[PDB]
Enzyme design. Sequence first.
Site, PDB file in Angstrom:
ATOM      1  N   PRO A   1      42.370  44.097  49.176  1.00 32.78           N
ATOM      2  CA  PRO A   1      41.518  44.273  50.181  1.00 32.78           C
ATOM      3  C   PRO A   1      42.453  44.298  51.334  1.00 32.78           C
ATOM      4  O   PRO A   1      43.316  43.319  51.416  1.00 32.78           O
ATOM      5  CB  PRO A   1      40.183  43.695  50.169  1.00 32.78           C
ATOM      6  N   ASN A   2      42.198  45.022  52.337  1.00 30.45           N
ATOM      7  CA  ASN A   2      42.990  44.987  53.866  1.00 30.45           C
ATOM      8  C   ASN A   2      44.468  45.279  53.826  1.00 30.45           C
ATOM      9  O   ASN A   2      45.151  45.658  54.790  1.00 30.45           O
ATOM     10  CB  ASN A   2      42.936  43.482  54.264  1.00 30.45           C
TER      11      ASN A   2
ATOM     12  N   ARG B   1      43.617  29.582  50.010  1.00 30.91           N
ATOM     13  CA  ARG B   1      44.502  30.457  49.433  1.00 30.91           C
ATOM     14  C   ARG B   1      45.455  29.970  48.287  1.00 30.91           C
ATOM     15  O   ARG B   1      46.325  30.593  47.636  1.00 30.91           O
ATOM     16  CB  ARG B   1      45.367  31.009  50.479  1.00 30.91           C
TER      17      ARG B   1
ATOM     18  N   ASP C   1      39.298  38.521  34.476  1.00 30.26           N
ATOM     19  CA  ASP C   1      38.739  39.023  32.984  1.00 30.26           C
ATOM     20  C   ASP C   1      39.185  40.531  32.795  1.00 30.26           C
ATOM     21  O   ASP C   1      39.417  40.944  31.571  1.00 30.26           O
ATOM     22  CB  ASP C   1      37.460  38.651  33.205  1.00 30.26           C
TER      23      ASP C   1
ATOM     24  N   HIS D   1      52.246  38.379  45.988  1.00 35.48           N
ATOM     25  CA  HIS D   1      51.957  37.905  47.222  1.00 35.48           C
ATOM     26  C   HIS D   1      53.203  38.112  48.484  1.00 35.48           C
ATOM     27  O   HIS D   1      54.299  37.465  48.118  1.00 35.48           O
ATOM     28  CB  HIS D   1      51.392  36.177  47.387  1.00 35.48           C
ATOM     29  N   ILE D   2      52.863  38.783  49.293  1.00 32.94           N
ATOM     30  CA  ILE D   2      53.909  39.111  50.391  1.00 32.94           C
ATOM     31  C   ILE D   2      54.166  37.711  51.132  1.00 32.94           C
ATOM     32  O   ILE D   2      55.404  37.119  51.177  1.00 32.94           O
ATOM     33  CB  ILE D   2      53.435  40.087  51.182  1.00 32.94           C
ATOM     34  N   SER D   3      53.220  37.015  51.379  1.00 28.92           N
ATOM     35  CA  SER D   3      53.365  35.866  52.319  1.00 28.92           C
ATOM     36  C   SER D   3      53.345  34.549  51.023  1.00 28.92           C
ATOM     37  O   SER D   3      52.792  34.581  49.811  1.00 28.92           O
ATOM     38  CB  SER D   3      51.676  35.667  53.081  1.00 28.92           C
TER      39      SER D   3
ATOM     40  N   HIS E   1      41.758  34.944  45.114  1.00 29.26           N
ATOM     41  CA  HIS E   1      41.108  33.655  45.408  1.00 29.26           C
ATOM     42  C   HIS E   1      39.721  33.782  45.026  1.00 29.26           C
ATOM     43  O   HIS E   1      39.236  32.352  44.758  1.00 29.26           O
ATOM     44  CB  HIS E   1      41.332  33.133  46.752  1.00 29.26           C
TER      45      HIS E   1
HETATM   46  O1  LIG Z   1      50.379  39.406  49.930  1.00 31.12           O
HETATM   47  C1  LIG Z   1      49.795  38.138  50.252  1.00 31.12           C
HETATM   48  O2  LIG Z   1      50.638  37.611  50.734  1.00 31.12           O
HETATM   49  C2  LIG Z   1      48.371  38.208  50.109  1.00 31.12           C
HETATM   50  O3  LIG Z   1      48.224  38.486  48.703  1.00 31.12           O
HETATM   51  C3  LIG Z   1      47.394  39.101  50.833  1.00 31.12           C
HETATM   52  C4  LIG Z   1      46.224  38.797  51.282  1.00 31.12           C
HETATM   53  C5  LIG Z   1      45.680  37.586  51.338  1.00 31.12           C
HETATM   54  O4  LIG Z   1      44.453  37.517  51.396  1.00 31.12           O
HETATM   55  C6  LIG Z   1      46.304  36.654  50.268  1.00 31.12           C
HETATM   56  O5  LIG Z   1      45.793  35.268  50.411  1.00 31.12           O
HETATM   57  C7  LIG Z   1      47.727  36.932  50.178  1.00 31.12           C
HETATM   58  O1  LIG Z   2      29.034  36.891  27.664  1.00 30.28           O
HETATM   59  C1  LIG Z   2      29.652  36.090  28.171  1.00 30.28           C
HETATM   60  O2  LIG Z   2      30.110  35.176  27.272  1.00 30.28           O
HETATM   61  C2  LIG Z   2      29.855  36.104  29.491  1.00 30.28           C
HETATM   62  O3  LIG Z   2      29.000  36.064  30.244  1.00 30.28           O
HETATM   63  C3  LIG Z   2      30.962  37.199  29.764  1.00 30.28           C
HETATM   64  C4  LIG Z   2      31.917  37.267  30.372  1.00 30.28           C
HETATM   65  C5  LIG Z   2      32.606  36.185  30.992  1.00 30.28           C
HETATM   66  O4  LIG Z   2      32.802  36.476  32.254  1.00 30.28           O
HETATM   67  C6  LIG Z   2      31.423  34.912  30.943  1.00 30.28           C
HETATM   68  O5  LIG Z   2      32.242  34.119  31.441  1.00 30.28           O
HETATM   69  C7  LIG Z   2      30.777  34.831  29.850  1.00 30.28           C
END
Ligand SMILES: O=C(O)[C@]1(O)C=C[C@@H](O)[C@H](O)C1
Ligand SMILES: O=C(O)[C@]1(O)C=C[C@@H](O)[C@H](O)C1
EC number: 4.2.1.10
Lengths: 149, 149, 149, 149, 149, 149, 149, 149, 149, 149, 149, 149
Positions: free
Chosen positions: J14-15, J116, J91, J105-107, J84
């Site tokens: 994002p951004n 962060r 997952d 990460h750029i920064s 973050h």
């Molecule tokens: O590229 C980066 O430095 C970053 O990944 C980009 C946006 C921020 O939200 C991250 O904290 C850093």
């Molecule tokens: O079914 C689960 O065990 C789960 O809810 C599925 C994906 C994960 O992100 C959860 O931690 C567990």
Amino acid sequence: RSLANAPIMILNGPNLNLLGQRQPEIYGSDTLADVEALCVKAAAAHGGTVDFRQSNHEGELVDWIHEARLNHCGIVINPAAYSHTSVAILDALNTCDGLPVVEVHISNIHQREPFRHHSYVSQRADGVVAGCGVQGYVFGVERIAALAG
Amino acid sequence: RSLANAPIMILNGPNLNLLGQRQPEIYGSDTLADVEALCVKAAAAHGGTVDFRQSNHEGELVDWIHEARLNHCGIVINPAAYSHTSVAILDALNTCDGLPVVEVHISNIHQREPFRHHSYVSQRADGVVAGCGVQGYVFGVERIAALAG
Amino acid sequence: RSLANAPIMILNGPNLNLLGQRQPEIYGSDTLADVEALCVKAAAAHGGTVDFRQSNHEGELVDWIHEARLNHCGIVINPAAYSHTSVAILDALNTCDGLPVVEVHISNIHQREPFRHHSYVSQRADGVVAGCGVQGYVFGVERIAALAG
Amino acid sequence: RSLANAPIMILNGPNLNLLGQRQPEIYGSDTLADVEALCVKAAAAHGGTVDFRQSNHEGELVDWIHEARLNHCGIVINPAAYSHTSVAILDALNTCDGLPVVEVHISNIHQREPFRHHSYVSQRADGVVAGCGVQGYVFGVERIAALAG
Amino acid sequence: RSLANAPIMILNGPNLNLLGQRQPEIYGSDTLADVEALCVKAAAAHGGTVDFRQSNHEGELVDWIHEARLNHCGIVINPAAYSHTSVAILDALNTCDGLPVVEVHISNIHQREPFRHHSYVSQRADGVVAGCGVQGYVFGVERIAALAG
Amino acid sequence: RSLANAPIMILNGPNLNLLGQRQPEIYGSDTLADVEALCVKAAAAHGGTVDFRQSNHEGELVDWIHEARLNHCGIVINPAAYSHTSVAILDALNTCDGLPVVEVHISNIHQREPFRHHSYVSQRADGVVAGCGVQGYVFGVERIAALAG
Amino acid sequence: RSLANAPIMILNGPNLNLLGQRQPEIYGSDTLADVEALCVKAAAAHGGTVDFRQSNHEGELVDWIHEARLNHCGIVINPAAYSHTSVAILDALNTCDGLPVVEVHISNIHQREPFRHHSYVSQRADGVVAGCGVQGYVFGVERIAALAG
Amino acid sequence: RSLANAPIMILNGPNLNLLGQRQPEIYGSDTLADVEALCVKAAAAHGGTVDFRQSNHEGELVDWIHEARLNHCGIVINPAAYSHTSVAILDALNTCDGLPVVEVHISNIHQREPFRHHSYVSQRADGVVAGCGVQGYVFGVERIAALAG
Amino acid sequence: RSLANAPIMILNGPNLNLLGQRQPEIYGSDTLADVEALCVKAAAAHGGTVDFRQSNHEGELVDWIHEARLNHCGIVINPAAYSHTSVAILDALNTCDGLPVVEVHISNIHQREPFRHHSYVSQRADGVVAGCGVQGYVFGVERIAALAG
Amino acid sequence: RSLANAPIMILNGPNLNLLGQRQPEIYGSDTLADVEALCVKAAAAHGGTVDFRQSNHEGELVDWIHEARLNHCGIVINPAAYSHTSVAILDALNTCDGLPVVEVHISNIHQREPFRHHSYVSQRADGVVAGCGVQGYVFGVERIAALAG
Amino acid sequence: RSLANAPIMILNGPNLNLLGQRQPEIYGSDTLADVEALCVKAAAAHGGTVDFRQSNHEGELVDWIHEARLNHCGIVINPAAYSHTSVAILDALNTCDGLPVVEVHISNIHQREPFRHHSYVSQRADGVVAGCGVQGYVFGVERIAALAG
Amino acid sequence: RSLANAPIMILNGPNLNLLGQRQPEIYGSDTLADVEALCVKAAAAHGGTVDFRQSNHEGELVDWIHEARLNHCGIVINPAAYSHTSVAILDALNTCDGLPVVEVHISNIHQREPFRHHSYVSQRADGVVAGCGVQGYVFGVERIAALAG
Ligand SMILES: O=C(O)[C@]1(O)C=C[C@@H](O)[C@H](O)C1
Ligand SMILES: O=C(O)[C@]1(O)C=C[C@@H](O)[C@H](O)C1
Ligand SMILES: O=C(O)[C@]1(O)C=C[C@@H](O)[C@H](O)C1
Ligand SMILES: O=C(O)[C@]1(O)C=C[C@@H](O)[C@H](O)C1
Ligand SMILES: O=C(O)[C@]1(O)C=C[C@@H](O)[C@H](O)C1
Ligand SMILES: O=C(O)[C@]1(O)C=C[C@@H](O)[C@H](O)C1
Ligand SMILES: O=C(O)[C@]1(O)C=C[C@@H](O)[C@H](O)C1
Ligand SMILES: O=C(O)[C@]1(O)C=C[C@@H](O)[C@H](O)C1
Ligand SMILES: O=C(O)[C@]1(O)C=C[C@@H](O)[C@H](O)C1
Ligand SMILES: O=C(O)[C@]1(O)C=C[C@@H](O)[C@H](O)C1
Ligand SMILES: O=C(O)[C@]1(O)C=C[C@@H](O)[C@H](O)C1
Ligand SMILES: O=C(O)[C@]1(O)C=C[C@@H](O)[C@H](O)C1
């Protein structure tokens, strides 16, 4: 052991002797004898049997888990207050290598005081059922039947 | 007292009745009987004796600490899970004014789960031995022999 | 129940059997028998009686709390080490709906080790007296008399 | 290696050069030379020898661990202050794949300031001995002999 | 100082001027003047007298503690909100070397918001009474009587 | 609404579209389509029906919970990673006044990484079932059936 | 030792060899040689002398402390980064039973990064001067002169 | 300085002398000499040279950073264990005003023990490369080349 | 302002009115009047004067800081217990743009209870002197003289 | 897949659509189109291609990761704020068994706000590059090339 | 009360007597007299009046809250530094059952030092306005008018 | 942009589409349409207009912030659950250099669950209004009008 060859051990921790006598909003109105009958019926549907017990003593629960280790096909445990404090019961459950274990809480411990949020038993139990009332013991029996299968 | 006048009390906490029956990588293949025989031999080389016991019950261990306070020359204790939870055992040991106390863990608790890193018993034990296997009990006997002498 | 109709349960936790035998600067030189006598006297001034007990076992204290629930007019409890560790005792007290409960600590736990600063019993006890010596049990009885009143 | 084939490296961290010169209630009245002689005798009882050293420099300890890795049958180490701060010494001991390592503290670090409660070395040491006095060095030699054996 | 030779200082912190005007479930229906009368009567049974005061100002309470240090036989104090925030009042009580001090909380602060669970005053108070209602001030007077005795 | 009058909504969070395609030790070898069939069969035993859905989008799950609020008789939800991060899904479930909600986790989150130990959904879900495998969805359906009745 | 009998050891930790070469807003524009001359003058006013040193090595600083313990009248130390990380230096200063020790920081560590807020050296130092620029070293010498007197 | 006028300083911390001799799954099979050859080749493609060093001593690394501050065009540093413990090395890198600095970890420290998650060095390093294997040193060289040019 | 043109404000917080009356091991045997005389002498050696004050009231200290802001050449302040609790005093000192401020503690607050470790005043004070006895006030005056110059 | 057989997926959170339009001191003056060109060029040097994308939607990033799992040779990802917060993105990456993943990460996030410092993606990414500007994407591609080899 | 029957109490804490004399980037260039005139006009637009006060004393603020409780129709309070420290002012506002209370911060406390992030006052204030400059006092009057209405 | 030249963007987070349909004690009985009309009327008094929107999707809110950045005169935002979890929305608001931003919460989040106490948006919002009901949106419009003009 299979359900046909040995009973499911159903263990209940401290203060559950008083189940059904107060706090129905949290614990319901069924007694511990009512819960035993539910378990008996659920297990019979899979051709098994239950060995249902309750104690206020941490070391007695430890002894009962050692007995289950040798003579039972699985453990359905509601550790009650010991869930939150007993490393000894966790360690006893860790000696049951390969035995299906399901932890049950009648109440939804996650909505309650912060000291109820953590359970030492959950580190070993295969499955954990919380807040499904006394119906959670029938889920426990069902899961044990699936795992012993 | 001296080793010639009174036995060394050797106490073992919960689940240690199954020592040697599983988890040899963590606990070894020796049983508690094997451990008692090691202790007996160690104490005899100093002309002493041992009173070796095991319990799963926190209050029984407290009772046996009170007994040692009056009748024994020292305590070697593996509190097992109660190491991490029992203020009551710590307070029993605190009643043993002047009595040598050595805490023994077969496993190296510092390499295991974070709930095993803290022991209430260590705040009162004169010496703490961890991760030296069942040989740790022998060190406990030798330490008591040195402190009683 | 009133003080005229049923005794006040006075419960003492682990290690209190040794009261007066050591650490007088922290615990005083009065024995548990001495404490019992102070309680009997304070209750008698209110036309009441006392049922004074001590145990090192958490589960036995639970049992006794359930007994009080049905047969006594109040509970004065010095949980000793179990104050800091026992959710089971707290859940037993929670079953005493409407019964007056007063928690007593001979020592001022707030000046002692940090693990003594928190008590699970204090979440349910009506009143908590700390650091007033054995005189705190007299205050406990008086408070039960006022509440049963 | 076996004890017959190479010496046991015994390493001592900072400030241990002054052992016995002060704080006898914490560290005893034996000097570091006294400890070295205890160690020579203890290893001799198993047919072995020691290579006993002391340094105030973290990097020098690291170098000696690397030396031990190739030329010694085990390491007995009292890391002193570096126990609490040195990831580098932990990392050096981690390079000693399969080599027995025993950590020794003269004092019972668990009774002391909270910054002494944690030891980085304990994550790798096979066995940890604390609060057994300079006798803990003998225990370390005994445990190396048993592991090497 | 004895109770016969000097009054007991009774100090009340902020907002207690409104005691009994609201929140009867937490604080009761008795006013501060009703409390002072209870105290006057308890002290008179021991041949003593009370100097009962209330302030909303931390500094003024400090000033009054310095006065008691020189002229009073003990201090019963309900610091109210300053219990949780005032290092200055703790420091003032520390200057009262050998003077009996009892802290009182009408409400059971351990059942309330977490910011109320800690009191700086409890680090110096000889005894601490919480959750015994206004009857706790009578306990305070009785404890001062026993300590001054 | 009753089971006869409206379907149970069964919602699945991110990455569950891949269920059964990997990590069988954690998540099993059943696909999401297999899970849907289990749910269909369990609901039909109670005369009900299910509306089974899966999304990777937090805001779409929110929309579906609002839909269920008005048209469904209960919600069975496996929020997957959103269980640990989504205050938005909790607030959406909080708008479902009186509707039965059961949270399901295939895996036992309590045995996994610490960031998986907390679920925002658990704060509202009437019941929580973890580590009962895909059978937990049947438990969910069964609990909704009991609560809708 | 008195000031007339032995020099004051003035010890500087890592990176202080570059003092005055950068960051004048934090560390000033005086060099270490300029600081030494300030110290020499202040000590001369009390009939004493200084032994001024700098090192980047933790162990070297420990060795120099052991030297001061036997041959100097006090220690003024700016431990630089080791203030925040060195238990070894704290333990070395603890060997200096009875020797006056004053810790100096040119900068006000309490306005800087949180990792600079704690100093192990402050646990033993008699006095700690921070944020007084290089003039803090002069205060250090003056405090040593008063303590040696 | 440019790459054409001064070498790049490549610094390696403790235990890196044994790179490639064990733990290939974490650290790879290349030795430090192999790493230096990769860096020499990368720098040569930009017309530069490298000055490649390794040390187990914190103070020596500080000394070499001061050297690089005056004589080198940039620093690529794998601080090894000192990454997690050394304020001193952070403070030395802070003296390199305007000099490009890149921090390199062969392993992905974020996947390893919690004590390895934080680096003091990262607070000053312009860039930080972790878990790219020994290829991260080549990235380091390429980034210095871009910053210096 | 310069020292010749306006006095140095010297402010003392709660309980310092009793300085010298007790705890000589912590606070010395000099009274506050003795401290004032020390200050008067130190300022006079610089052609200056002091305005020495003490109060138990946080608000009064705030008022006096605003007075100093307009009328004095600097502030030496021992905030006593308010060091640890008073954001208000910190905020008052923050209004003294450009005025030299030195914080003084007679005792070494870093060796005492953890609640004394943090001071809100240290965030604004130019220099902080602790554990240098009443001599630290003289260091405060000297630092103000150097900064006003 | 190899680089010759399938594109490298380059994902941006994002951004990042506004890259280069502001905050050049943190993010530089290159746009996302400029970064894409850098990536195309780096890949082409290894005979590969890139599939460069940006989204502000957490779920869409999840979907694209699943696409990559099946059709691409590796993933270079700058998750931006989702780094973050997003367990769901972690997952999704965990479903890419065997696929090379590099986090960029750029920064230098380690020098920025504490929220962060932690990235969920870092738990799964093979390599993590931070603070190397847009050049970090070139390193990412280079690392994918080496791992796919 | 209604706005017609009683003034709105407008309370300001410590240091706000210097508003407008410094730090215009944080606090603006309006004086406290300017703010009082804005409030008079805002209240007049609803037919009401204000009683505007400022104090550096915590207990005087408590006294004024008690006065407001009986004689005013609402309270707008900028507690300044006491917002972060005063349980006592929180307890005084809690005595104002049913009275509208609005807390105002000129600055955006959430962008400032972490010790400003929490306000005890916010636990009882109906509304909390932060970072809207002195215009936040007008919003506070507006909200009191709506709540009184 | 001025209010005459461009609309004020008024953004609403997840679940606010149900505002007024439940929980009137917390959120009031006004709908989002009612809130929009309050806004439109407040802006028209200053000669401006509003662009009022609601979404349950985090990335859509990011997109709308980017839109406001170029086309609108300020942002009034109630981020709802995203206030607590979205670093992405904070980062979107941070791209709006110089644009006035006011954060609004209908409820007093400081009196609610601890997870509601922190808002990422508050780090960038110029002003933050909480617990002022839907009237808070009007204060937002007024603040934007004052900042834009
Ligand atoms: O590229 C980066 O430095 C970053 O990944 C980009 C946006 C921020 O939200 C991250 O904290 C850093
Ligand atoms: O079914 C689960 O065990 C789960 O809810 C599925 C994906 C994960 O992100 C959860 O931690 C567990
Ligand atoms: O069944 C339960 O819900 C519980 O296990 C029983 C007793 C309590 O002590 C547990 O917290 C909950
Ligand atoms: O002997 C031990 O290593 C232990 O004491 C025994 C059982 C466990 O509960 C302890 O953690 C360790
Ligand atoms: O009476 C007491 O002071 C105490 O309750 C008794 C034993 C201890 O374990 C408690 O901490 C205190
Ligand atoms: O032998 C010891 O007890 C110790 O290892 C030596 C020095 C201290 O720094 C350690 O904390 C303990
Ligand atoms: O008497 C009490 O219960 C209390 O001391 C009085 C006021 C509150 O501020 C305290 O928390 C409790
Ligand atoms: O003199 C100082 O202010 C300091 O001691 C020197 C170096 C830093 O590492 C310390 O933090 C401060
Ligand atoms: O290269 C590394 O991955 C590391 O820097 C080297 C040694 C360890 O001590 C670091 O933790 C990681
Ligand atoms: O002078 C001091 O050491 C102190 O400032 C005075 C009183 C205490 O409250 C401080 O903690 C220390
Ligand atoms: O108005 C303010 O912004 C503030 O309330 C005033 C003084 C400070 O102490 C508060 O932190 C904020
Ligand atoms: O308007 C509010 O009070 C809130 O922003 C809306 C929804 C919740 O998620 C926030 O916590 C509060």
